[PDB]
Design a protein around this ligand. Structure first.
Ligand SMILES: OC[C@H]1O[C@H](O[C@H]2[C@H](O)[C@@H](O)[C@@H](O[C@H]3[C@H](O)[C@@H](O)[C@@H](O)O[C@@H]3CO)O[C@@H]2CO)[C@H](O)[C@@H](O)[C@@H]1O
Length: 687
């Protein structure tokens, strides 16, 4: 007879999706843990009074780590190491003397501290960009050496240093005479109202050369290409320091160090400032789901113990079943401080505009996606509180969550995780299965529409037809599925394309456009796929003889107006700029009027604009009737068949499309369109 219990702190979510009703109590407990931790954090002040969550995070990165005082020329260094009996700062600055610079004060928190006076001549005691370590003496008397956990730069060893010590990274004290000063404002952006179209990029591979390309090169040579394409945002992968390049950035060693293989912190600041000057937001891949198992240059056994940053190996909760990585103890207050400060550091010091949290499925579940892990979810809820407080109404957070955890992207006040978007990570496999298993005459229009529109209510989605995952050596891109190993001989504009190439180009544009318009509330493109980049991506590793041959991006292809890669590129630019003028991404789901299984025609309206796709492999249609709700005059604003997009220029884009007041496909009006085989068009109503 008991009333079904719907606690007030998840009423918002339950109203959004009443399917959640039988889970309301477990959802309420999940939020409640996060809300109690939030209270704990906001009262972690000397007198126990309330502080803001932002102030907590900012005070943390301003007081942990090493800080040079530019006025007094002192240096302060503090380091959390509860298991260590003694701590010493060693480095080039003191010829690695293990006695002269003890961090004598160990506080109630287990934090060692030291202040270094200026030198007799007034110089900083630690030279700019010289090497440092902290040495701990453990209770048993043994010694271990570590890169400080909050170091802002860590570099690969020289050939000689690695001959004597191995590949272990070296910590650097970064204190340049002239820090980069930001000159440009963040672009105007309202998360609730504005569309975000995301260019996913990796600095190291961003040149045609088989090398690690630099921050400066990206700023000079790639940013203009992204501006030309009209993307709203760049998602920078592999920025947090990682010693193993082929990890793609996912094995993080130094959480507060931007990767040094691409250049200096000031080079990356300039990169982000320049993106901002061009109106482009910059997002960071944040890997807070696990850490590299490296000791000394990583956090594993940092203080000599197996229960500081990570759940212990004997707890059964301490290592990943596949990644060979350690798992954070999110219930430790100092680990919460470390991770939350890390987010504020990247927003504040580098002016990133938001984050993509990688590994969210591994965080959410006690078995990591092969029961929910309440502590990891509560940390993500705090993380969203903080990021949205740092940049109110502008900040973006995005979850990489393959599981589709309900409420992940509902607001925290509703009882949800607080993410703005999740990745639509099932969508690439739909396109691969069609291309690999079904003949073209056998494409099911309804199954395409169902998969693209199957989105949880209220949980906004970044759609894409392929991502950095699929570009990798494990799989083939859409370009490879559609055109195999096509070469410059197949891609010349000076001869008629084969059937294969003609079909590949048309579908490459059509698949992107229907994903972009029907599949989500935001869009993502992985670097190179906007122009159908050939071959595949691969990083140097043992399995390929440390080759960089595939660790690059042939951007030169786009500049050759006698090849067809540029046709794909120009269409991508047209798609993004069309959406910028005629919003359809961050809008309610489409109203689909047609998914015709014999004609292979899909038609829908979204945000008042009309979208028509003829997927039929051979049949062209003339005077094809399309239902339209709002009567008026329509004009084509995007046309896949245009010559400069690599089409055959059959469609007259000057034509005025007048509606006729006669019911059709459950709409009050119709227009009539010419749609050749494998073409698509977008129309908007003229005012
Ligand atoms: O001491 C100067 C020399 O070493 C510097 O730091 C190292 C320590 O001094 C050193 O004791 C070292 O300990 C290593 C062991 O000797 C060795 O067996 C190795 O295999 O494991 C330990 C590595 O941690 O620890 C540090 C390493 O940074 C500095 O690195 C050198 O540039 C300097 O020439």
């Amino acid at each position: 007879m008991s009333l079904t219990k719907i606690p007030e702190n998840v009423q918002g979510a339950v109203s959004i999706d009443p399917w959640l009703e039988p889970f309301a109590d477990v959802l309420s407990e999940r939020r409640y843990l996060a809300d109690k931790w939030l209270y704990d954090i906001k009262h972690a002040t000397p007198d126990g009074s309330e502080q803001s969550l932002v102030d907590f995070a900012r005070n943390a990165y301003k007081t942990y780590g090493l800080h040079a005082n530019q006025q007094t020329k002192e240096i302060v260094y503090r380091e959390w190491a509860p298991n260590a009996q003694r701590a010493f700062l060693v480095g080039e600055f003191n010829n690695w003397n293990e006695e002269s610079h003890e961090m004598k004060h160990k506080d109630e928190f287990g934090v060692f501290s030291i202040t270094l006076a200026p030198l007799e001549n007034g110089d900083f005691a630690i030279p700019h960009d010289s090497k440092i370590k902290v040495m701990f003496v453990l209770p048993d008397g043994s010694k271990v050496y570590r890169i400080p956990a909050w170091i802002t730069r860590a570099t690969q060893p020289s050939k000689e240093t690695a001959q004597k010590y191995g590949p272990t990274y070296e910590g650097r004290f970064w204190n340049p005479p002239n820090s980069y000063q930001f000159k440009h404002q963040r672009p105007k952006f309202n998360l609730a109202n504005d569309s975000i179209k995301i260019y996913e990029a990796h600095i190291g591979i961003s040149s045609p050369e088989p090398k690690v390309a630099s921050y400066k090169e990206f700023t000079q040579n790639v940013l203009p290409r992204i501006k030309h394409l009209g993307y709203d945002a760049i998602q920078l992968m592999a920025i947090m320091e990682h010693a193993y390049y082929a990890s793609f950035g996912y094995q993080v060693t130094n959480f507060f160090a931007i990767s040094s293989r691409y250049g200096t912190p000031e080079d990356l600041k300039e990169l982000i400032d320049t993106a901002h000057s061009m109106g482009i937001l910059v997002l960071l891949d944040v890997i807070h789901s696990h850490a590299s198992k490296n000791s000394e240059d990583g956090l594993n056994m940092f203080d000599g113990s197996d229960h500081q940053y990570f759940h212990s190996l004997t707890s059964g909760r301490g290592e990943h079943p596949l990644w060979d990585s350690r798992l954070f103890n999110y219930g430790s207050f100092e680990v919460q401080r470390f991770l939350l400060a890390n987010l504020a550091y990247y927003i504040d010091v580098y002016q990133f505009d938001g984050f993509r949290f990688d590994g969210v499925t591994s965080m959410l579940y006690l078995h990591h996606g092969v029961g929910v892990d309440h502590e990891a979810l509560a940390y993500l809820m705090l993380a969203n509180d903080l990021v949205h407080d740092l940049l109110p109404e502008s900040a973006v957070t995005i979850a990489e969550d393959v599981s589709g955890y309900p409420t992940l992207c509902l607001p925290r006040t509703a009882g949800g995780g607080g993410f703005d978007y999740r990745l639509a990570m099932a969508l690439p496999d739909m396109w691969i299965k069609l291309l690999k298993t079904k003949q073209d005459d056998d494409w099911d229009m309804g199954h395409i529409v169902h998969t693209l529109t199957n989105r949880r209510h209220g949980e906004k989605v970044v759609a894409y037809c392929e991502s950095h995952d699929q570009a990798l050596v494990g799989d083939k891109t859409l370009a490879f599925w559609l055109m195999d190993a096509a070469m410059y001989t197949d891609m010349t504009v000076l001869k008629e394309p084969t059937l294969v190439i003609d079909r590949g180009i048309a579908l490459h544009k059509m698949i992107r456009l229907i994903t972009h318009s029907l599949g989500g509330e935001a869009y993502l493109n992985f670097e190179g796929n906007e122009f159908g980049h050939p071959e595949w991506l691969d990083f140097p590793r043992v399995g390929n003889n440390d080759s960089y041959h595939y660790a690059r991006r042939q951007f030169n292809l786009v500049d050759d107006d006698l090849l067809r890669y540029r046709h794909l590129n120009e269409f991508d630019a047209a798609m993004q700029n069309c959406e910028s003028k005629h919003q359809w991404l961050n809008t309610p789901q489409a109203y689909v009027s047609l998914k015709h299984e014999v004609d292979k025609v899909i038609a829908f309206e979204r945000n008042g604009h009309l979208f028509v796709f003829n997927f039929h492999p051979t049949q062209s249609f003339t005077d094809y009737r399309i239902g339209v709700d709002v009567a008026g005059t329509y004009k084509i604003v995007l046309n896949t068949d245009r010559a400069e997009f690599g089409g055959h220029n059959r469609i007259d884009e000057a034509q005025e499309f007048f509606t006729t007041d006669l019911e059709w496909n459950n709409r009050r009006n119709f227009i009539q369109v010419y749609i050749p085989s494998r073409t698509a068009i977008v129309l908007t109503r003229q005012m």
